[PDB]
Structures are given as C-alpha cells and as structure tokens.
Amino acid sequence: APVTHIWYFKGVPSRLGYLLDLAPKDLEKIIYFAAYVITSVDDEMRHNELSTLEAEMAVEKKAVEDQRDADLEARAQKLEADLAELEAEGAKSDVRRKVRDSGEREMRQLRDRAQRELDRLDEIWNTFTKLAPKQLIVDEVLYRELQDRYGEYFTGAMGAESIKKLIENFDIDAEAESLREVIRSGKGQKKLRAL
Amino acid sequence: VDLLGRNKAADEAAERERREEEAYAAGVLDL
Numbered sequence: 001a002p003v004t005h006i007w008y009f010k011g012v013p014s015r016l017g018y019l020l021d022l023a024p025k026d027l028e029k030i031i032y033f034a035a036y037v038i039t040s041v042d043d044e045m046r047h048n049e050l051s052t053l054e055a056e057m058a059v060e061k062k063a064v065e066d067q068r069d070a071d072l073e074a075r076a077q078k079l080e081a082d083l084a085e086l087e088a089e090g091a092k093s094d095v096r097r098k099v100r101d102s103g104e105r106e107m108r109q110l111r112d113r114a115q116r117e118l119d120r121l122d123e124i125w126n127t128f129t130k131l132a133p134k135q136l137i138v139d140e141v142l143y144r145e146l147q148d149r150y151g152e153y154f155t156g157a158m159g160a161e162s163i164k165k166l167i168e169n170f171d172i173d174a175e176a177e178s179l180r181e182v183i184r185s186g187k188g189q190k191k192l193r194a195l
Numbered sequence: 196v197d198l199l200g201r202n203k204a205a206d207e208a209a210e211r212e213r214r215e216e217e218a219y220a221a222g223v224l225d226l
Contacts, residue, residue, distance in 0.1 A: 189212055
C-alpha cells in the first residue's frame with residue numbers, strides 16, 4: 001500500500017503542505033487515515049445539473065416536511081384525544097397536566113428528529129454545491145451520504161494514494177506565477193508566507 | 196496600563212514578525 005516519506009512531511013517546513021497550501025494537521029490526518037479529501041471533481045458537468053439537483057433535493061425536502069406537518073397535526077389530535085379521555089373520568093387536572101406535558105414532549109421530540117433530518121439534508125446539499133478539491137471531511141457520514149447519491153460525479157480517496165492522484169492533478173506554473181504575483185503585489189506576513 | 200497590563204502571545208508573534216522583517220530586508224536564512 002502506497003506510503004509517504006516523513007522527511008518531507010513532519011520537518012518544518014513541511015514540503016507537502018507548502019506545495020499544496022495546507023496545514024500539517026490536515027495532512028497527518030489524511031495520511032494516518034482520519035479525514036478524507038477530494039482528488040478531483042467536474043465543474044462543467046456539475047454546471048448543467050445544479051438546477052435539477054436542487055429540484056430533486058427540494059422535492060425530497062417538501063416530502064419530508066409534508067410528513068413533518070402531518071406528524072405535528074396527527075400527534076396533536078392524539079393529544080386532544082388523550083386529554084378528553086383523561087378528564088371525562090374522575091381524575092384531577094394535576095395528573096392531566098403531567099400526562100399532557102409528556103405528550104408535549106412527544107410532539108416535541110417528533111418534530112425534533114424531523115428538523116434534525118431537515119438540517120442534515122440541507123447541510124449536505126450546501127456541501128455538495130460548495131465543492132472544491134483538497135477539502136477535508138472529518139465526518140465519515142456526510143462523506144458516505146454524498147458517496148451514495150452522486151459520488152460517481154466527484155472522485156475521493158484517502159492515504160498516500162490521495163496525495164499521489166492530487167499531485168498528478170495539479171498545475172504548477174500557474175501556482176508559481178500566482179505566488180510571484182502575491183509576493184510582488186501583496187505585503188506583510190502574507191508576502192513572507194508566499195515567499 | 197496597570198489594570199490592563201501586557202499580554203504575551205501577541206508580543207511573541209509581533210517580535211517574531213519584526214525579526215523576520217529585519218531579516219528579509221538584508222538576508223533571510225534565520226533558523
């Protein structure tokens with residue numbers, strides 16, 4: 001299994017981080033199998049589809065939120081039944097308000113897992129639309145949850161192989177000239193870092 | 196100046212940058 005060379009990773013400056021504009025911690029994570037990175041993706045293929053991918057995401061979200069409002073109202077009618085059948089017989093209203101607080105907890109937790117799934121799917125979409133390579137993923141869930149839907153669009157890996165693919169997929173004179181230009185124009189500590 | 200005093204982190208970073216600014220003007224190999 002491919003593997004890298006400590007001499008060019010750990011010692012300061014870490015030559016790999018400088019070549020790739022990274023921090024070490026990121027890279028000690030990618031090499032010791034902690035985070036994942038995106039070797040490459042397609043920008044023009046993801047161009048003519050953003051609209052309809054939004055369409056599919058939005059139809060899924062409208063589905064789940066229709067079910068969410070249905071959850072709210074159905075649990076609410078069950079709660080009304082619970083109160084009406086808790087008061088018709090001979091009980092105090094202390095116990096009724098306790099059981100209704102329990103039912104309130106029930107509707108709350110239902111809508112809560114509901115909105116949690118909402119926010120999960122929404123952050124997932126917001127991560128897809130905002131994709132550039134060299135991004136890390138400390139999640140393992142967001143990543144999988146993107147590998148199942150459209151994973152075949154982008155390309156991901158981890159380990160020596162990821163850095164290898166990347167280096168291969170990396171222009172160099174562009175970076176060199178942009179760096180010469182950041183040194184020329186820019187100033188301060190930023191100039192020194194680009195240097 | 197006696198209620199606020201003087202931090203450390205900022206001073207370290209500042210003198211660092213200053214050192215690498217007096218070293219780049221003439222010749223930068225400091226290590």
